Amino acid sequence: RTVARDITLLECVGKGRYGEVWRGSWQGENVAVKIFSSRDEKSWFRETELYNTVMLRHENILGFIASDMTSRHSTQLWLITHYHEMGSLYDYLQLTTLDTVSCLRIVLSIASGLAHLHIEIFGGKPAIAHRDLKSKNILVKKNGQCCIADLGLAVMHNNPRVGTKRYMAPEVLDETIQVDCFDSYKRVDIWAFGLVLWEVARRMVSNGIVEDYKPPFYDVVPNDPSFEDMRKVVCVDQQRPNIPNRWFSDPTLTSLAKLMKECWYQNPSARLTALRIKKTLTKID
Numbered sequence: 537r538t539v540a541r542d543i544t545l546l547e548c549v550g551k552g553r554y555g556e557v558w559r560g561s562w563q564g565e566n567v568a569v570k571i572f573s574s575r576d577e578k579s580w581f582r583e584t585e586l587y588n589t590v591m592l593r594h595e596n597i598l599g600f601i602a603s604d605m606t607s608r609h610s611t612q613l614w615l616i617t618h619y620h621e622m623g624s625l626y627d628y629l630q631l632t633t634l635d636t637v638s639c640l641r642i643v644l645s646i647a648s649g650l651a652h653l654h655i656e657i658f659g660g661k662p663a664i665a666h667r668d669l670k671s672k673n674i675l676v677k678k679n680g681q682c683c684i685a686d687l688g689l690a691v692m693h694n695n696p697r698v699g700t701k702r703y704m705a706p707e708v709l710d711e712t713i714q715v716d717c718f719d720s721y722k723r724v725d726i727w728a729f730g731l732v733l734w735e736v737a738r739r740m741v742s743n744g745i746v747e748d749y750k751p752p753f754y755d756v757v758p759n760d761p762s763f764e765d766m767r768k769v770v771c772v773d774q775q776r777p778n779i780p781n782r783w784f785s786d787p788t789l790t791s792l793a794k795l796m797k798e799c800w801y802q803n804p805s806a807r808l809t810a811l812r813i814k815k816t817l818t819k820i821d
């Protein structure tokens with residue numbers, strides 16, 4: 537039989553230190569093709585090893601299609617996934633505001649994806665921690681739900697080696713994280729989840745008011761904040777993202793402020809679990 541492997545790369549939709557992401561076409565169908573830099577080859581190996589161990593399939597996890605290694609004169613490393621034309625949550629929040637139903641649908645879908653990663657199923661799948669959760673690593677689907685992307689730093693029950701500094705938990709910044717305990721990595725994801733919840737909630741309209749899109753800690757650290765910049769804010773001063781007064785006039789944003797506080801405790805073991813966040817979100821509105 538013919539094995540059709542040609543992908544037409546149509547347009548570059550992302551460029552960074554990691555390499556590039558392209559919208560591509562395979563057999564009439566849109567795919568996303570991540571082309572890894574030599575700098576970030578370990579992310580391709582980790583994601584590939586994870587998918588070789590467990591073929592994750594979940595509506596709120598970016599859908600795997602293929603991992604390709606091709607010999608050149610160098611080695612070319614591609615990861616091929618489903619394509620989400622609306623782009624990342626980061627991209628989407630810049631222009632778009634949200635109503636109550638759209639805000640809740642986004643954050644419950646992220647909680648659903650994250651709980652699916654975290655849970656060991658004994659049938660099944662090992663427990664997985666993401667280790668780089670942020671709004672750029674979440675894609676928006678046409679049905680209003682999101683999916684979690686980029687398992688290049690994921691751990692299974694370290695890696696390329698640290699996550700995005702702006703989203704690092706206090707125990708990562710102060711180097712107290714108990715690195716031999718798998719639950720430690722789940723708790724780091726919950727911290728980052730809380731920051732994403734804050735980024736989304738700001739864009740939910742209430743009483744004719746909305747906040748502009750800002751990244752977590754926009755008001756206390758520079759662009760491309762250093763490790764030290766983040767440690768001083770999060771660990772030494774114990775600062776947390778601001779909850780605007782206008783949220784306390786809206787029952788949904790009041791409930792979301794309480795949830796994000798319960799993701800941001802200095803004590804990692806005090807933070808809510810992804811399953812408890814899902815349950816809380818299903819009872820809001």
Ligand SMILES: COc1cc(-c2cncc(-c3ccc(C4CCN(C)CC4)cc3)c2C)cc(OC)c1OC
Pocket residue numbers: 538539540541542562601602604616
């Ligand atoms: C190698 O490389 C790539 C391959 C493909 C691809 C193209 N056509 C058909 C296939 C296919 C799938 C599954 C079977 C089964 C049939 C039942 N039998 C009992 C076991 C085997 C055969 C063939 C594939 C996997 C796409 C790619 O990109 C999207 C590839 O990557 C470049």
Ligand SMILES: COc1cc(-c2cncc(-c3ccc(C4CCN(C)CC4)cc3)c2C)cc(OC)c1OC
Pocket residue numbers: 562565601602
């Ligand atoms: C990698 O990705 C894609 C692959 C394909 C594709 C192409 N040829 C054959 C297959 C296939 C056929 C049959 C089996 C099974 C059937 C039951 N039992 C006998 C074991 C073997 C598996 C695989 C597929 C899945 C299509 C896709 O999209 C339409 C893909 O997505 C881009």
Ligand SMILES: COc1cc(-c2cncc(-c3ccc(C4CCN(C)CC4)cc3)c2C)cc(OC)c1OC
Pocket residue numbers: 549550557568569570615616617618619620621622623624627672673674675685686687
């Ligand atoms: C995060 O991680 C990965 C993401 C993807 C991915 C999948 N669907 C769609 C996208 C996308 C499409 C389009 C835009 C637009 C936004 C508006 N404007 C700025 C021009 C461009 C942004 C994003 C991406 C980037 C694939 C991946 O691997 C193949 C990823 O890595 C695992």
Ligand SMILES: O=C(O)[C@H]1CCSC1
Pocket residue numbers: 577578579581
């Ligand atoms: O790039 C790396 O360091 C990884 C390759 C496979 S295992 C370690």
Ligand SMILES: O=C(O)[C@H]1CCSC1
Pocket residue numbers: 648649651652655
């Ligand atoms: O086990 C889980 O939590 C996943 C099943 C479908 S939704 C999440």
